[PDB]
């Protein structure tokens, strides 16, 4: 991972790309069908877990302290770049295997998650990787309604509080991870005190009208908790929920020879 | 016609790199892939904007445009 | 739609016993095969069961060792043939179908040529 | 190093080794514009070597 | 123009700023930019959302006001409603108003205009007390609503500006002076800084906390704005002196109101109580401020003014704290009744009781720890310690911030502060009521192993907090003493049964917890001798002792960098049986010390001296005495002691370096070595006598007889050699040492480019730049001697350094080898040899820049050339190499006489420890250079002219010059109105890498250029380039058919060229496209010719004889 997160970042002899690296790991945490082979002649839940702690190690380790010459200064920008790399990095590659690998992280981990992003709450890596850690747990549902639970619901519920408060202090590329926690939150912490999650719900839409992913997730969590929530709560502000949604709305070789088809052999907003 | 020995040497391979030139076709048949592969990902990005009036500069408007450049936009 | 509208010209085309009916016909499915072999979603899932019709269609119409008949056939097979290489498996409920015709199409008549 | 390639080669293969007499030759001859002595001391040596296993069987 | 777009935006800002400066003249002045300034107020100052269009409303309206003021008089803004007055009336009133947005909005848009605002000298004498006041409040308002409100930093900053400009600008303040009066201090009079200072003086006590401490703070830093008296505390004792019992009330308005209300809401109202509280915490800050500023002593709030609501609250901690967590016993009145922030209002208090104890014991000697006594009981030693011990204990405690994490050093503060207190003993009798320190080390004896009980994790982690923040208090010992001697075995062994009977399983929460235990033993003192031993467990699962290591490297590491040689004293001992796990557990020192530099590595350093004390205590090692696994791991052992010490001590002769330095040697005798193994301790010679250069060349003796093809590409030896000797150039490299560069040549310099000399040439090219000019100098001098086959060595190796050495010790080494040279330039292979190495670095020595004997030189090197086996010719080449180089400077006119990841990535590295004819080239330069210093020319070209043009001389001398003015064409282009006379005929009938090749060269540089000369002037000219052609339509054939058709698009390109001199022959065009007319295709290439002629607009065929001129194109249609 020190060797993933060197390579720079691209903006907008031939030099090796660092986004490459996951298909690998795609198959390297998905290996069941190749270690029981090679046992003819678990462990990748023991590869998730080292992952696990690697990934711990380093955001404990890493520092991301920074000046004002508002005015994003990095004091160690090569470390800034190194953190968001090693952020996508783990929100592309976590969701794939089973959370419930996870499972025993779901408290320390998140816990000192929530300090680091507390240490400088402006770093929308943080919000990524802590908004795939939450979409695993649901995924593997933990919630339910053990002091364990009782704690971390109670962290979630006044960590989703003070983001919902202070997002509105945060402009794009922070603010749209803020939304996206606020959207990838689960029906059950939100049950208390839904109305402030409103207004952020109607400027996730009309944000994500300027950039389609945003809204396609705000969408999901909007089925999600009109499924699971009881309307009675929700009725009042649903004049206030359809007006953001007005958008998406009011817009407007190859021949007959036979080469197997080797082109077919290899393999939005509309939508 | 002064890359005539330009492209007598470019093209000067009288020692045998036969193997050498297909391997090399194919390897950068490989790489255009790799350039197509990120090309329709490219094009999927929204086309550049145009605009059909001039831009002018200054402290206090003018009202010196033309009235084509009213009606193009 | 033109690959409705070329199914029921080639339903039509070989009405009459000739020759120039089959090149017709060959010629329609060539037409056919360069162009729904480029769907982009959605013109494949009409292509099915415009399939269907003609696959079926010729099944039971064409019936005869006539070669006019036999170009055609043979060009849609090639065709169901490089369509189904990268089709998916969404094509299975006739796939058996196809197979109840497929050997059917082969042992009979198939068979004599 | 090739002192002990020819020791092993003539008690191993059994013959006059001409090839061996080469080795040697090239083993003591390439001295004439360095002073390495230790070098030239352990070319004496499998020179002493050689020798003894020469008179040993035929040559 | 606040948008999420570059194009619109970016066009935008511009059409508002241009308006903006537009609509604020005299013309347009008044109803039509009323409009604009009232939207300007209302678009960002109120809204839910987008900053963006908050910060652009901000500073857009304040370059408004700048370019209002700009361009139009004062008297125009005064008479007019569109004043800066107005909006500072709007700005203050919309602050005013009870809603978020239109105080954050004012706030933010004075912090934008501010910049520029505090430039202006009238308005702020006109306006300061007004602001002041102003954001005072909404910055009350603020606390008032909700702290995490976005208003409350827009509110600091600009109080922030505020303070800025005050203490900027005091003079006007400090007099008394009649400016206009703000809501605050209702008596109007000639306003002072004094006033409205001592207006929020007697202020202070406000429910608003942080509004209250950030007023005290800015009045504190205002005392000496003053114009009179200073900031001491003495003029807060004159303000004392008269106001001696007031500020009870005064300062503090709190503690219920005074007393009384703090009384009411203890039986009648939970908001009403949470507001006492809340008060009561700002007047116990205000408090706590004032002592911890030294500005005013404890006895004058305890024995002055007595402020019973602080026993009154102590009253209501033995009401409340700990006890009531639902219910103040009002019996008037979780989310339904809002236990949260009820709970956060107790941590609070909680917190703010705290520091008050640490100030009043720290700030006030225990001569005012009889004002401690005023509580009789102080009754919160009862209770803090089980805060101490379980934060749910006051309370809830629920949501684990920064609040809670904090809370301990505050804690460890008061502990230390109450040590120092008598009380503590009674806290220690409260410390070993809370806990007997023995009670929980059977509970925790429950098998915590996967799945188990979690309350035992949690009580077990709540004791190690505890006891953590003892031990940072200085007190071990207060709750449990020494058992039977300083070694607490009551922790060591319960460490060693459940680190062995875990698996005689594992979880990372047992495994912190376990490190959690690791260091409250580490605590204990003693401990690690007994842990050493424990370390050093033979009981096999491999052994359990090492294991242990394993599970705990860290932690082990921590607790033995406190240890300096104790441990390590006994490892060495104990080293003599036992080498893994006490060589792993000296790697882990290493890494650790290593590891440890942001505040000194010195610990590693006194580590490495004393292991090197120790060093001869382990001798069953490093010799033949031990397995040659171990003498690689004291290999690595020492190159990491050697890589983390400095290379100044134990480099040279310093106490136990000759020890290892010796073995060293020893280590570099043992034969029995691996020759790659011996070439991986040789890789730390760069850290470094005789002996030692000895011992090197009888080890390399035995390595590289004469040969290095004698081994076989690929062969396991032929490996080990080539990574054995680019260890040897790295390790060179690194070191720059001469003797090991004159070693390394002399073993290289043997058979041209046999030992992959590409890579010692390059190593040379980099270490020419690096080291001093007097160690180049003395460098390249040594090479010179040992120069004095025997030229193979300079050749390979001078001129490496010569033409990338530095260019002052290149004149320091030369200048001593002036004469030196001189002398000596003056069987015989080796007088040849010498010369040629001398005439080699005489040419790079000159090539540099110009005493002055050095005039005679030049000829001493011209004859050398000039006189008319082999080696007599290489020396002619040398001569002229070095004439051009001298000429390249004298003779330059004519006649020239014929990261923290990259951080981690090292310290990973570190603990793994893993890192066609040449002979002519001069004189293209030479050509190149005196084109740049300046048809017919005494520049030799007529010279040479004539030298090439006639065809009598040796073909190599032609093949010599075709090359030449092959790469030089470009210098004469205006005289190729000649040379294209000789090269036609030298390309005539031309005869060595092979004919084609430079017969192809040179059409194509001839061709180069069309206009500037064709062969039309003379019959020769164009008869010989009918030859020519001729000689290349026999020539023209490839089995490539693509160098083939290369050269047909040639002849394409030359014949139409010039169309006016070229012939066709017909006959062997006839026969070519003729052919045997056969079935198969072989004068299908001459049918290719004919597409030539008829690339060409001249006529399809002409009988310039007649080959028959009627069936002449039979052929063409036979062959079709």
Same mark, same amino acid.
């Given at each position: 991972l020190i060797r993933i997160c060197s390579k720079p970042v691209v903006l907008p002899w031939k030099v090796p790309t660092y986004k490459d690296y996951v298909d690998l790991f795609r198959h390297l945490l998905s290996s069941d069908q190749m270690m029981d082979s090679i046992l003819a002649d678990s462990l990748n839940h023991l590869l998730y877990d080292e992952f696990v702690k690697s990934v711990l190690k380093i955001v404990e380790k890493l520092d991301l302290t920074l000046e004002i010459q508002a005015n994003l200064h990095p004091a160690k920008p090569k470390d800034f770049s190194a953190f968001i790399n090693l952020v996508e990095f783990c929100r592309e590659i976590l969701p794939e295997k089973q959370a419930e690998f996870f499972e025993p992280w779901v408290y320390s981990f998140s816990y000192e998650l929530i300090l680091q992003s507390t240490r400088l709450p402006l770093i929308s890596g943080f919000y990524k990787l802590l908004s795939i850690t939450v979409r695993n747990a649901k995924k593997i549902k933990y919630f339910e309604g053990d002091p364990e639970k009782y704690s971390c619901f109670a962290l979630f519920v006044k960590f989703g509080k003070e983001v919902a408060v202070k997002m509105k202090q945060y402009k794009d590329e922070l603010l749209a991870s803020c939304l996206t926690f606020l959207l990838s939150l689960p029906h059950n912490i939100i049950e208390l005190d839904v109305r402030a999650y409103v207004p952020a719900l109607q400027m996730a839409f009309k944000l994500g009208l300027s950039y389609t992913p945003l809204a396609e997730v705000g969408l999901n969590a909007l089925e999600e908790w009109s499924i699971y929530i009881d309307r009675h709560v929700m009725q009042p502000y649903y004049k206030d929920i359809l007006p953001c949604l007005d958008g998406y709305l009011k817009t407007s070789f190859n021949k007959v020879v036979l080469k197997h088809l080797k082109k077919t052999k290899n393999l939005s907003l509309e939508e | 016609g002064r890359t005539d020995l330009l492209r007598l040497r470019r093209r000067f391979m009288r020692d045998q790199e036969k193997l050498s030139l297909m391997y090399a076709r194919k390897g950068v048949a490989?790489?255009?892939?790799?350039?197509?592969?990120?090309?329709?990902?490219?094009?999927?990005?929204?086309?550049?904007?145009?605009?059909?009036?001039?831009?002018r500069h200054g402290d206090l408007p003018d009202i010196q445009i033309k009235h084509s450049s009213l009606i193009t936009p | 739609c033109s690959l409705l509208r070329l199914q029921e010209t080639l339903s039509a085309a070989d009405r009459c016993g000739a020759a120039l009916a089959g090149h017709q016909l060959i010629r329609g499915l060539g037409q056919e095969c360069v162009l729904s072999s480029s769907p982009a979603v959605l013109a494949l899932q009409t292509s099915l069961v415009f399939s269907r019709d003609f696959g079926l269609l010729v099944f039971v119409r064409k019936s005869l060792n006539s070669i006019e008949f036999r170009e055609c056939r043979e060009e849609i097979l090639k065709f169901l043939c490089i369509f189904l290489e990268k089709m998916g498996q969404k094509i299975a409920p006739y796939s058996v179908e196809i197979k109840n015709t497929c050997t059917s199409v082969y042992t009979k008549d198939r068979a004599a040529k | 190093n090739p002192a002990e390639n020819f020791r092993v080669l003539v008690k191993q293969k059994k013959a006059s080794f001409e090839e061996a007499s080469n080795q040697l030759i090239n083993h003591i001859e390439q001295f004439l514009d360095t002073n390495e002595t230790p070098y030239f001391m352990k070319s004496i040596d499998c020179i002493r070597a050689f020798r003894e296993e020469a008179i040993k069987f035929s040559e | 123009a606040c948008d999420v777009d570059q194009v619109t935006r970016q066009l935008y800002e511009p059409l508002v700023m241009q308006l903006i400066h537009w609509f604020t003249n005299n013309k347009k002045f008044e109803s039509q930019d009323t409009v604009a300034l009232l939207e300007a107020i209302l678009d960002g100052i109120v809204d839910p959302v987008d900053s963006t269009l908050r910060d652009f409303c901000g500073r857009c309206i304040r370059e408004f006001l700048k370019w209002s003021i700009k361009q139009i008089t004062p008297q125009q803004q005064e008479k007019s409603p569109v004043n800066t007055k107005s909006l500072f009336k709007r700005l203050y009133s919309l602050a005013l108003h009870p809603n978020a947005f239109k105080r954050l909005g004012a706030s933010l848009a004075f912090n934008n205009i501010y910049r520029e605002f505090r430039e202006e000298e009238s308005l702020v004498e006109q306006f300061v007390f007004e602001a002041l006041v102003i954001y005072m409040e909404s910055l009350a308002l603020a606390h008032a609503d909700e702290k995490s409100l976005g208003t409350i930093q827009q509110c600091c900053d600009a109080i922030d500006h505020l303070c800025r400009i005050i203490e900027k600008k005091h003079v006007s303040l400090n007099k008394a002076k009649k400016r206009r009066l703000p809501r605050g201090f209702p008596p109007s009079a000639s306003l002072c800084l004094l006033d409205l200072v001592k207006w929020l003086l007697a202020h202070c006590g406000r429910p608003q906390t942080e509004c209250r401490h950030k007023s005290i703070e800015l009045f504190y830093k205002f005392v000496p704005l003053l114009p009179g008296n200073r900031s001491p505390n003495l003029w807060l004792k004159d303000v004392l002196k008269?106001?001696?019992?007031?500020?009870?009330?005064?300062?503090?308005?709190?503690?219920? %109101?005074?007393?009384? !209300?703090?009384?009411?809401?203890?039986?009648?109202s939970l908001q009403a109580t949470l507001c006492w509280l809340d008060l009561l915490l700002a007047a116990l800050e205000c408090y706590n401020t004032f002592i911890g500023e030294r500005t005013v002593g404890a006895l004058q709030v305890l024995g002055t003014e007595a402020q019973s609501s602080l026993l009154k609250a102590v009253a209501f901690f033995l009401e409340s704290i700990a006890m009531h967590d639902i219910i103040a016993a009002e019996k008037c009145f979780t989310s339904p009744q809002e236990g949260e922030r009820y709970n956060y209002s107790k941590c609070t208090v909680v917190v703010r009781i705290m520091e008050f104890t640490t100030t009043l014991l720290?700030? !006030?000697?225990?001569?005012?720890?009889?004002?401690?006594?005023?509580? %009789?009981?102080?009754?919160?030693?009862?209770? $803090?310690?089980?805060?101490? %011990?379980?934060?749910?204990s006051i309370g809830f405690n629920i949501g684990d911030v920064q609040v809670?994490?904090?809370?301990?050093?505050? %804690?460890?503060?008061?502990?230390?502060? $109450?040590?120092?207190?008598?009380?503590?003993?009674?806290?220690?009798?409260?410390?070993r009521e809370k806990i007997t320190a023995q009670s929980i080390e059977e509970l925790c004896a429950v098998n915590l192993y996967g799945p188990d009980a979690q309350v035992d994790r949690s009580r077990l982690a709540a004791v190690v907090s505890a006891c953590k923040q003892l031990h940072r208090a200085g007190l071990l010992h207060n709750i449990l003493p020494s058992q039977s001697t300083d070694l607490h075995h009551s922790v060591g062994t319960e460490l060693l049964s459940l680190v062995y009977k875990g698996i005689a399983s594992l979880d990372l929460s047992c495994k912190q917890l376990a490190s959690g235990l690791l260091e409250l033993a580490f605590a204990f003192g003693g401990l690690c001798e007994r842990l050493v031993s424990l370390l050093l467990n033979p009981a096999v699962l491999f052994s359990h002792g090492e294991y242990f290591y394993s599970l705990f490297s860290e932690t082990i590491n921590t607790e033995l960098l406190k240890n300096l040689d104790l441990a390590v004293l006994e490892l060495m001992q104990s080293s003599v049986d036992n080498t893994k796990m006490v060589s792993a557990v000296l790697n882990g020192m290493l890494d650790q010390s290593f590891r440890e530099r942001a505040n000194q590595k010195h610990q590693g350093l006194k580590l490495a001296t004393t292991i090197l004390q120790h060093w001869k205590k382990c001798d069953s090692w490093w010799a033949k005495d031990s397995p040659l696994e171990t003498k690689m791991a004291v290999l690595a052992l020492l190159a990491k002691i050697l890589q983390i010490d400095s290379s100044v001590s134990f480099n040279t002769s310093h106490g136990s370096f000759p020890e290892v330095f010796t073995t060293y040697i020893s280590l570099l005798a043992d034969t029995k070595l691996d020759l790659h193994l011996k070439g991986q301790a040789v890789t730390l010679l760069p850290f470094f006598l005789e002996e030692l250069r000895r011992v090197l060349e009888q080890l390399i003796v035995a390595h590289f007889p004469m040969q290095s093809r004698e081994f076989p590409p690929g062969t396991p030896r032929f490996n080990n050699y080539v990574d054995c000797m680019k260890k040897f150039l790295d390790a060179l490299e690194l070191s720059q040492s001469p003797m090991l560069l004159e070693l390394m040549t002399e073993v290289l310099c043997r058979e041209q480019q046999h030992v992959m000399e590409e890579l010692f040439q390059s190593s040379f090219r980099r270490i020419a730049r690096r080291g001093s000019c007097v160690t180049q100098v003395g460098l390249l001098e040594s090479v010179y001697e040992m120069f004095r086959t025997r030229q193979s060595f300079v050749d390979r190796s001078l001129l490496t350094l010569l033409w990338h050495c530095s260019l002052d010790a290149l004149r320091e080494f030369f200048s001593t080898i002036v004469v030196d040279a001189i002398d000596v330039?003056?069987?015989?292979?080796?007088?040849?040899?010498?010369?040629?190495?001398?005439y080699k670095i005489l040419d790079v020595m000159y090539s540099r820049l110009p005493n002055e004997l050095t005039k005679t030189l030049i000829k001493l090197c011209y004859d050398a050339f000039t006189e008319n086996l082999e080696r007599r010719r290489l020396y002619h080449c040398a001569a002229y190499n070095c004439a051009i180089s001298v000429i390249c400077c004298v003779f330059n006119e004519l006649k020239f006489y014929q990261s923290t990841l990259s951080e981690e990535m090292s310290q990973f590295d570190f603990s793994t420890g893993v890192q066609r004819h040449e002979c002519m080239a001069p004189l293209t330069a030479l050509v190149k250079h005196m084109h740049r210093s300046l048809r017919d020319l005494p520049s030799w070209m007529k010279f040479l002219h004539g030298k090439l043009g006639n065809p009598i001389v040796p073909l190599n001398i032609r093949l010599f010059l075709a090359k030449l003015v092959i790469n030089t064409e470009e210098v004469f282009r205006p005289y190729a109105k000649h040379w294209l006379s000789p090269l036609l005929q030298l390309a005539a009938s031309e005869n060595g890498e092979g004919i084609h090749y430079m017969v192809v060269e040179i059409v194509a540089t001839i061709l180069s250029w069309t206009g500037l000369a064709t062969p039309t002037g003379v019959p020769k000219d164009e008869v010989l380039a009918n030859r020519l052609l001729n000689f290349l339509m026999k020539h023209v054939f490839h089995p490539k058919r693509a160098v083939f058709r290369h050269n047909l698009e040639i002849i394409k390109t030359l014949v139409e060229c010039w169309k006016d001199c070229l012939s066709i022959p017909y006959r062997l065009i006839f026969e070519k496209f003729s052919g045997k007319d056969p079935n198969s295709k072989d004068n299908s290439v001459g049918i290719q010719l004919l597409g030539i002629v008829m690339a060409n607009d001249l006529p399809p065929y002409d009988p310039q004889c007649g080959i028959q001129s009627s069936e002449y194109f039979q052929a063409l249609v036979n062959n079709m």
């Amino acid at each position: 991972l020190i060797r993933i997160c060197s390579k720079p970042v691209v903006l907008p002899w031939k030099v090796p790309t660092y986004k490459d690296y996951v298909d690998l790991f795609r198959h390297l945490l998905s290996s069941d069908q190749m270690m029981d082979s090679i046992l003819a002649d678990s462990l990748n839940h023991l590869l998730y877990d080292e992952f696990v702690k690697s990934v711990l190690k380093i955001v404990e380790k890493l520092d991301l302290t920074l000046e004002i010459q508002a005015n994003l200064h990095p004091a160690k920008p090569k470390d800034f770049s190194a953190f968001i790399n090693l952020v996508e990095f783990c929100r592309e590659i976590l969701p794939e295997k089973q959370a419930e690998f996870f499972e025993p992280w779901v408290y320390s981990f998140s816990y000192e998650l929530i300090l680091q992003s507390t240490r400088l709450p402006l770093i929308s890596g943080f919000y990524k990787l802590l908004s795939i850690t939450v979409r695993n747990a649901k995924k593997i549902k933990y919630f339910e309604g053990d002091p364990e639970k009782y704690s971390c619901f109670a962290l979630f519920v006044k960590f989703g509080k003070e983001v919902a408060v202070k997002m509105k202090q945060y402009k794009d590329e922070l603010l749209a991870s803020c939304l996206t926690f606020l959207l990838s939150l689960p029906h059950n912490i939100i049950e208390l005190d839904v109305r402030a999650y409103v207004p952020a719900l109607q400027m996730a839409f009309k944000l994500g009208l300027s950039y389609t992913p945003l809204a396609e997730v705000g969408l999901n969590a909007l089925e999600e908790w009109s499924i699971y929530i009881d309307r009675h709560v929700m009725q009042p502000y649903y004049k206030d929920i359809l007006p953001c949604l007005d958008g998406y709305l009011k817009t407007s070789f190859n021949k007959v020879v036979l080469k197997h088809l080797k082109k077919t052999k290899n393999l939005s907003l509309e939508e | 016609g002064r890359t005539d020995l330009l492209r007598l040497r470019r093209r000067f391979m009288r020692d045998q790199e036969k193997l050498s030139l297909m391997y090399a076709r194919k390897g950068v048949a490989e790489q255009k892939r790799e350039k197509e592969i990120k090309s329709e990902l490219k094009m999927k990005q929204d086309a550049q904007v145009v605009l059909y009036r001039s831009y002018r500069h200054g402290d206090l408007p003018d009202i010196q445009i033309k009235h084509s450049s009213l009606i193009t936009p | 739609c033109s690959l409705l509208r070329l199914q029921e010209t080639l339903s039509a085309a070989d009405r009459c016993g000739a020759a120039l009916a089959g090149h017709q016909l060959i010629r329609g499915l060539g037409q056919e095969c360069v162009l729904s072999s480029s769907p982009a979603v959605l013109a494949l899932q009409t292509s099915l069961v415009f399939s269907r019709d003609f696959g079926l269609l010729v099944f039971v119409r064409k019936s005869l060792n006539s070669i006019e008949f036999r170009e055609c056939r043979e060009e849609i097979l090639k065709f169901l043939c490089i369509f189904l290489e990268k089709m998916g498996q969404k094509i299975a409920p006739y796939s058996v179908e196809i197979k109840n015709t497929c050997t059917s199409v082969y042992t009979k008549d198939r068979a004599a040529k | 190093n090739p002192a002990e390639n020819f020791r092993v080669l003539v008690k191993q293969k059994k013959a006059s080794f001409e090839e061996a007499s080469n080795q040697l030759i090239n083993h003591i001859e390439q001295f004439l514009d360095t002073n390495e002595t230790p070098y030239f001391m352990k070319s004496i040596d499998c020179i002493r070597a050689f020798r003894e296993e020469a008179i040993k069987f035929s040559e | 123009a606040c948008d999420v777009d570059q194009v619109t935006r970016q066009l935008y800002e511009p059409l508002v700023m241009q308006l903006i400066h537009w609509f604020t003249n005299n013309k347009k002045f008044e109803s039509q930019d009323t409009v604009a300034l009232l939207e300007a107020i209302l678009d960002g100052i109120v809204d839910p959302v987008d900053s963006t269009l908050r910060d652009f409303c901000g500073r857009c309206i304040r370059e408004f006001l700048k370019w209002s003021i700009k361009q139009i008089t004062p008297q125009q803004q005064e008479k007019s409603p569109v004043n800066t007055k107005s909006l500072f009336k709007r700005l203050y009133s919309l602050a005013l108003h009870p809603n978020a947005f239109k105080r954050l909005g004012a706030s933010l848009a004075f912090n934008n205009i501010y910049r520029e605002f505090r430039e202006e000298e009238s308005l702020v004498e006109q306006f300061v007390f007004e602001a002041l006041v102003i954001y005072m409040e909404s910055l009350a308002l603020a606390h008032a609503d909700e702290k995490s409100l976005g208003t409350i930093q827009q509110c600091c900053d600009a109080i922030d500006h505020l303070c800025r400009i005050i203490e900027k600008k005091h003079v006007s303040l400090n007099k008394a002076k009649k400016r206009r009066l703000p809501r605050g201090f209702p008596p109007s009079a000639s306003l002072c800084l004094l006033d409205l200072v001592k207006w929020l003086l007697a202020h202070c006590g406000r429910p608003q906390t942080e509004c209250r401490h950030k007023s005290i703070e800015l009045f504190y830093k205002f005392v000496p704005l003053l114009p009179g008296n200073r900031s001491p505390n003495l003029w807060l004792k004159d303000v004392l002196k008269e106001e001696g019992v007031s500020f009870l009330i005064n300062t503090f308005e709190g503690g219920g %109101c005074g007393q009384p !209300s703090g009384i009411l809401a203890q039986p009648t109202s939970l908001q009403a109580t949470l507001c006492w509280l809340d008060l009561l915490l700002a007047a116990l800050e205000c408090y706590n401020t004032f002592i911890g500023e030294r500005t005013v002593g404890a006895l004058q709030v305890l024995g002055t003014e007595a402020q019973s609501s602080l026993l009154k609250a102590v009253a209501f901690f033995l009401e409340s704290i700990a006890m009531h967590d639902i219910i103040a016993a009002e019996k008037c009145f979780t989310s339904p009744q809002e236990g949260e922030r009820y709970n956060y209002s107790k941590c609070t208090v909680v917190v703010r009781i705290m520091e008050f104890t640490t100030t009043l014991l720290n700030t !006030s000697p225990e001569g005012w720890k009889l004002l401690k006594k005023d509580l %009789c009981n102080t009754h919160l030693m009862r209770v $803090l310690v089980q805060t101490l %011990c379980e934060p749910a204990s006051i309370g809830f405690n629920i949501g684990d911030v920064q609040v809670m994490a904090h809370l301990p050093d505050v %804690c460890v503060n008061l502990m230390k502060a $109450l040590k120092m207190s008598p009380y503590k003993d009674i806290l220690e009798t409260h410390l070993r009521e809370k806990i007997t320190a023995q009670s929980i080390e059977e509970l925790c004896a429950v098998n915590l192993y996967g799945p188990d009980a979690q309350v035992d994790r949690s009580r077990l982690a709540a004791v190690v907090s505890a006891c953590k923040q003892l031990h940072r208090a200085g007190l071990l010992h207060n709750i449990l003493p020494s058992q039977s001697t300083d070694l607490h075995h009551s922790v060591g062994t319960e460490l060693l049964s459940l680190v062995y009977k875990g698996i005689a399983s594992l979880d990372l929460s047992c495994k912190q917890l376990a490190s959690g235990l690791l260091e409250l033993a580490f605590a204990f003192g003693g401990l690690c001798e007994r842990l050493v031993s424990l370390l050093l467990n033979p009981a096999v699962l491999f052994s359990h002792g090492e294991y242990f290591y394993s599970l705990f490297s860290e932690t082990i590491n921590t607790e033995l960098l406190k240890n300096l040689d104790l441990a390590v004293l006994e490892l060495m001992q104990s080293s003599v049986d036992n080498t893994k796990m006490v060589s792993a557990v000296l790697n882990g020192m290493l890494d650790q010390s290593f590891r440890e530099r942001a505040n000194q590595k010195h610990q590693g350093l006194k580590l490495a001296t004393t292991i090197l004390q120790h060093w001869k205590k382990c001798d069953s090692w490093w010799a033949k005495d031990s397995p040659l696994e171990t003498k690689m791991a004291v290999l690595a052992l020492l190159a990491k002691i050697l890589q983390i010490d400095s290379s100044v001590s134990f480099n040279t002769s310093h106490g136990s370096f000759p020890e290892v330095f010796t073995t060293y040697i020893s280590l570099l005798a043992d034969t029995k070595l691996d020759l790659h193994l011996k070439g991986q301790a040789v890789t730390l010679l760069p850290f470094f006598l005789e002996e030692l250069r000895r011992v090197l060349e009888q080890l390399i003796v035995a390595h590289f007889p004469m040969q290095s093809r004698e081994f076989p590409p690929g062969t396991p030896r032929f490996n080990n050699y080539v990574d054995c000797m680019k260890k040897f150039l790295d390790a060179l490299e690194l070191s720059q040492s001469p003797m090991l560069l004159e070693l390394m040549t002399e073993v290289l310099c043997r058979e041209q480019q046999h030992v992959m000399e590409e890579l010692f040439q390059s190593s040379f090219r980099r270490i020419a730049r690096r080291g001093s000019c007097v160690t180049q100098v003395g460098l390249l001098e040594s090479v010179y001697e040992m120069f004095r086959t025997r030229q193979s060595f300079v050749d390979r190796s001078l001129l490496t350094l010569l033409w990338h050495c530095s260019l002052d010790a290149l004149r320091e080494f030369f200048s001593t080898i002036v004469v030196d040279a001189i002398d000596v330039l003056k069987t015989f292979d080796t007088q040849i040899t010498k010369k040629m190495g001398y005439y080699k670095i005489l040419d790079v020595m000159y090539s540099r820049l110009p005493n002055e004997l050095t005039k005679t030189l030049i000829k001493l090197c011209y004859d050398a050339f000039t006189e008319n086996l082999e080696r007599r010719r290489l020396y002619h080449c040398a001569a002229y190499n070095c004439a051009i180089s001298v000429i390249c400077c004298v003779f330059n006119e004519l006649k020239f006489y014929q990261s923290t990841l990259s951080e981690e990535m090292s310290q990973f590295d570190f603990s793994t420890g893993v890192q066609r004819h040449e002979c002519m080239a001069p004189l293209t330069a030479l050509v190149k250079h005196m084109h740049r210093s300046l048809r017919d020319l005494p520049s030799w070209m007529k010279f040479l002219h004539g030298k090439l043009g006639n065809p009598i001389v040796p073909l190599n001398i032609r093949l010599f010059l075709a090359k030449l003015v092959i790469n030089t064409e470009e210098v004469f282009r205006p005289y190729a109105k000649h040379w294209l006379s000789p090269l036609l005929q030298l390309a005539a009938s031309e005869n060595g890498e092979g004919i084609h090749y430079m017969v192809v060269e040179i059409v194509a540089t001839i061709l180069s250029w069309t206009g500037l000369a064709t062969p039309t002037g003379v019959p020769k000219d164009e008869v010989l380039a009918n030859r020519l052609l001729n000689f290349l339509m026999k020539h023209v054939f490839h089995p490539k058919r693509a160098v083939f058709r290369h050269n047909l698009e040639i002849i394409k390109t030359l014949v139409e060229c010039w169309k006016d001199c070229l012939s066709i022959p017909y006959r062997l065009i006839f026969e070519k496209f003729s052919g045997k007319d056969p079935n198969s295709k072989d004068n299908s290439v001459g049918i290719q010719l004919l597409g030539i002629v008829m690339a060409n607009d001249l006529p399809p065929y002409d009988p310039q004889c007649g080959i028959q001129s009627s069936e002449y194109f039979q052929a063409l249609v036979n062959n079709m």
